[PDB]
Scaffold this active site. Sequence first.
Site, PDB file in Angstrom:
ATOM      1  N   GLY A 101       0.775  -1.257   0.000  1.00  0.00           N
ATOM      2  CA  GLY A 101       0.000   0.000   0.000  1.00  0.00           C
ATOM      3  C   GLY A 101       0.809   1.312   0.000  1.00  0.00           C
ATOM      4  O   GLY A 101       0.299   2.355   0.416  1.00  0.00           O
ATOM      5  N   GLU A 102       2.061   1.250  -0.440  1.00  0.00           N
ATOM      6  CA  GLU A 102       2.889   2.439  -0.653  1.00  0.00           C
ATOM      7  C   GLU A 102       3.273   2.537  -2.148  1.00  0.00           C
ATOM      8  O   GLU A 102       4.361   2.156  -2.531  1.00  0.00           O
ATOM      9  CB  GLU A 102       4.161   2.327   0.191  1.00  0.00           C
ATOM     10  CG  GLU A 102       3.942   2.398   1.699  1.00  0.00           C
ATOM     11  CD  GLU A 102       3.491   3.760   2.182  1.00  0.00           C
ATOM     12  OE1 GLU A 102       3.512   4.722   1.389  1.00  0.00           O
ATOM     13  OE2 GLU A 102       3.109   3.866   3.368  1.00  0.00           O
ATOM     14  N   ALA A 103       2.379   3.050  -2.986  1.00  0.00           N
ATOM     15  CA  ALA A 103       2.548   2.971  -4.446  1.00  0.00           C
ATOM     16  C   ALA A 103       3.852   3.546  -4.974  1.00  0.00           C
ATOM     17  O   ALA A 103       4.531   2.908  -5.772  1.00  0.00           O
ATOM     18  CB  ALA A 103       1.369   3.619  -5.156  1.00  0.00           C
TER      19      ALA A 103
END
Length: 195
Positions: A101-103
């Site tokens: 979830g850290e693009a």
Amino acid sequence: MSKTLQRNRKMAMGRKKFNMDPKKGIQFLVENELLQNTPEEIARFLYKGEGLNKTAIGDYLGEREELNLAVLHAFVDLHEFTDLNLVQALRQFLWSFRLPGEAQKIDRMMEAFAQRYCLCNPGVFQSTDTCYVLSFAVIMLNTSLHNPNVRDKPGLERFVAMNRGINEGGDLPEELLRNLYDSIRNEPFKIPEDD
Ligand SMILES: Cc1cc(O)cc(C)c1NS(=O)(=O)c1ccccc1
């Protein structure tokens, strides 16, 4: 002897500190002469990963500042992908850290991976973009095939269709795509748990 025993305990403390906050852990290790403050030495420390949480390794590798970017580059360079197919390479890489979830951070990591894969295997993909896109295709395929929450199990023919045109405007060889599909179908990715 006393110096050695003290250093060993301080190393253990440094690992615990790293798991609480990666930058503070590295700082403690560097400041106590337990780890050299070079991108390569920090990368080797993270690659060995002794007593280090894979989420913490990912967090450190995902930082934007210069040194962390250099460590990321050096860490990827420790991976030897020559004569591995893309799935074999991804299995190794994806086991070495975790960062969901850290693009923007994942983008940097996967671009570094793609560049390294292509440098190790120059004949496979002429375009690193092809490698990047196909790497995510394989990750997506793994989820689609092995997560029961997705009811559409894409067959080979669908996987082939989804990747049209990404090989410098042409297609990847069908046998390459079949080999990747079958590898994932027969063995899901081993993904580090949230630690
Ligand atoms: C590779 C993977 C696949 C998953 O289904 C779940 C997780 C946590 C991971 N690890 S992940 O860090 O979230 C990730 C890494 C690289 C690309 C995409 C995601």
